[PDB]
Every structure is written in C-alpha cells, then in structure tokens.
Amino acid sequence: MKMTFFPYELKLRHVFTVATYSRTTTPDVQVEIEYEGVTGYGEASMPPYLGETVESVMNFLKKVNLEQFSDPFQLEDILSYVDSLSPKDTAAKAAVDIALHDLVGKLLGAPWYKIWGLNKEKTPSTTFTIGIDTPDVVRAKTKECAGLFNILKVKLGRDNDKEMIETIRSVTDLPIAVDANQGWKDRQYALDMIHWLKEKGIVMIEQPMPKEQLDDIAWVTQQSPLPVFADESLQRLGDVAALKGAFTGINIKLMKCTGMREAWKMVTLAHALGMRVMVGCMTETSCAISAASQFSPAVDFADLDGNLLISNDRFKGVEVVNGKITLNDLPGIGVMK
C-alpha cells in the first residue's frame, strides 16, 4: 500500500487558549493510505506546546515504509513497527494508525464502533468550551451555544476561576466540566476550589495540578467530591496502571496515545482497573474527531468538539445532534472527504 502526507494548517475560528498559551491556528498533517483502490484517511494535530511540529511529523512519516507490508489487516505487526521507528512522535504515529483503521474498516465494510461491538445509540454528550473573557463576552457566547449542548467545558486553572463559574452560571444552569489544565500548582487551593465548583454546578474536574506533582494530585483525589480525570499526566497505555488511585479516571486522546488501537486498549485497561474513561481531542478536523468517536459509546465523558473550533475542516464525519456525538454508518472512521 502507498502512504502520502502533506501539511494542512488548521485555521481556528477564534483565539484558543490553553493554560498560558493562545493561538488561532494549529499545525497539522493530513495522511492517506491507498490500497487496491481504497483510501484510508489519517491525521496528526500538533498543538505547538506539545512538542511536535510539521517538520518532525513530516520527517517521521518519511521514515515509515508501508510498501513492505502487503496486508493492511496486520495492524498489530504494522503499528508495532511504526512505534519502533522512534521513542515518541505519538501524533505522527496516530495519523498512520487512524489511516490504517479507516482503510481496514472500509475493506470490511463497517464502522469501527461496529467492529468493536458497541451500540452507537450509547454515544455520550460532548462538552463545548466557554472561553475566558469579560463578563459580557462570556455570557454572550455561553448564551449562543447553551442551546446546542448538554454540558459545557470551562478551562480554569487560572486566577478568576471562582469568577468565570459565576458569570457563566448566571445565564445558564447546564452542568459544567472544568479543566484546570495543571493550573492549580498549590494543593489545598485546588481541593477546596473543587468543593466550591461542585456547589456551583460543576460535575467533573480534569488535570488540577501539574503532572510532576503526582503526590499533590493523588492527595487531592480521595478528598475531592468530583471525579478527577488524568490528562497531561497520562500519555500512553503504559502510563495507565501507575495512575490508579491518583485519579478517578483517564482522558484518552489519539494524538497522545498513537491512535485507535492503543486507545481501545487503554479503555479496556482503565475499566479493568476500575478507573473511569473519558475521550478528549486537540483542535482537529473531522478525521481524527470521528476516529475517536468510534469508541465513545464506551466512555463516560467526551470532549469531542475539536472540528467545531476550526474553519477549514475537510471532512464530514460525526455530527453533534441534541448535544450528543452522533456516528453515521460510513465504514472505517466514518468520514466523507
């Protein structure tokens, strides 16, 4: 089979903020794998702060030899080989993984949620983000979207956390999921900041402290009234077991774990250890978002709005209907170029 790839920068509709960073674009590489007339689509999204770039991803993909593989169904052997080409480049490896499942699914004539034996009717509601701004700009956007979602996401980990909730909580009573994003470097300042939110309608807390301080995080979890989910603290399958106890659940993202195959294994592992599972995303096109939505029926929370934040999506895949992630019946990852 043949693989091709090219840079495809994502244009964000509005300033996008993460911790102390902001951007209006996101480096991204689009991947394709052709085989006997069939094409599987893959994608790598690279928020600048995560360490990968157009260059690194393009370089990594140049190092992948797929022509040496005659059977696309050997995802175990093929993706194991891909992983071996470098110690990281998880986003770059995800693009190949995603493209391969798309291809395999197409060849099987089935969506991966089906191949995996899940009920698409059990997909969750996805959160949508309420950016940080002035009490006016805030209540405005909250107003504009509260009618389309069942749960909203707020990126706290800031200074006016208690502020945002109030502003937002004034013009809406929708449950809120907060992502400190490692903003609360303290310990007690984070624990109580949670009982508070819990009193103000928040229903889940994600990545409170920085990954480095696992002791603080762990500590804060058994004393937290709301489920804490690991994000920055977990990258791949081998990082899951070590988080039991420290977190209530894990947040899986294809760009971080290297794709669908490892992601699915993480869902199985997390659950086997009694942990909860949520699925997240970076700003991505409908390619990676749909790929991850394929296993969303098996999770508890989903932050799969990535494609809604960009203006140059090149695929029509999963739609948000009645606030829920909605899978179509297209085979593979479920998108149409």
- Numbered residues of the known binding site: 23, 49, 153-155, 179, 206, 231, 253, 281-283, 303-305
272 binds a second copy (CB under 8 A): yes
Q: Which of 32, 231, 262, 284 binds Mg ion (CB under 5 A)?
A: 231
Query: How many Cβ atoms are within 10 Å of 217's Cβ, its own excluded?
Result: 25
Residue 238 contacts a second copy per CB under 8 A: yes
Q: Which does 231 bind (CB under 5 to 8 A by kind): Mg ion, a second copy, none?
A: Mg ion
**Which of these ranges, 85-93, 219-227, 249-257, 267-275, lies near a second copy under the rule CB under 8 A?**
267-275
Triad 315, 142, 152: Cα angle to 5°: 65
Quick one: what does residue 75 bind among a second copy, Mg ion, none, with the CB cut-off 5 to 8 Å set by partner type?
Answer: a second copy
Distance CA 267, CA 252 (A): 8
List binders of Mg ion among 170-209 (CB under 5 A).
Answer: 179
**Binding-site residues for substrate:** 23, 49, 153-155, 253, 281-283, 303-305
Q: Give the residue ranges of DSSP H helices in 27-74.
A: 54-62
Contact 129, 39 (CB under 8 A): no
Of residues 3 and 230, the one with the C-beta less far from Mg ion: 230
Q: How far is 323 from 327, CA to CA, in rounded Å?
A: 13
The radius of gyration of the chain's CA atoms, rounded to the nearest angstrom, is 19
Using CA atoms, how far apart are residues 36 and 254, in angstroms rounded to an integer?
27
- State which of positions 173-192 bind a second copy (CB under 8 A): none
What interhelical angle do 161-170 and 188-199 show, nearest 10? Answer: 10
Closest contact distance (angstroms) between CB of 154 and a second copy is: 32
User: How many Cβ atoms sit within 10 Å of the Cβ of residue 117?
Assistant: 8
- Which of a second copy, Mg ion, none interacts with 54 (beta carbon under 5 to 8 A by kind)? none
Binding residues for Mg(2+): 179, 206, 231
What residues from 43 to 82 belong to the interface with a second copy (CB under 8 A)?
73-77
Total interface residues for a second copy by CB under 8 A: 27
| Number of other CB atoms surrounding residue 87 within 10 Å | 7
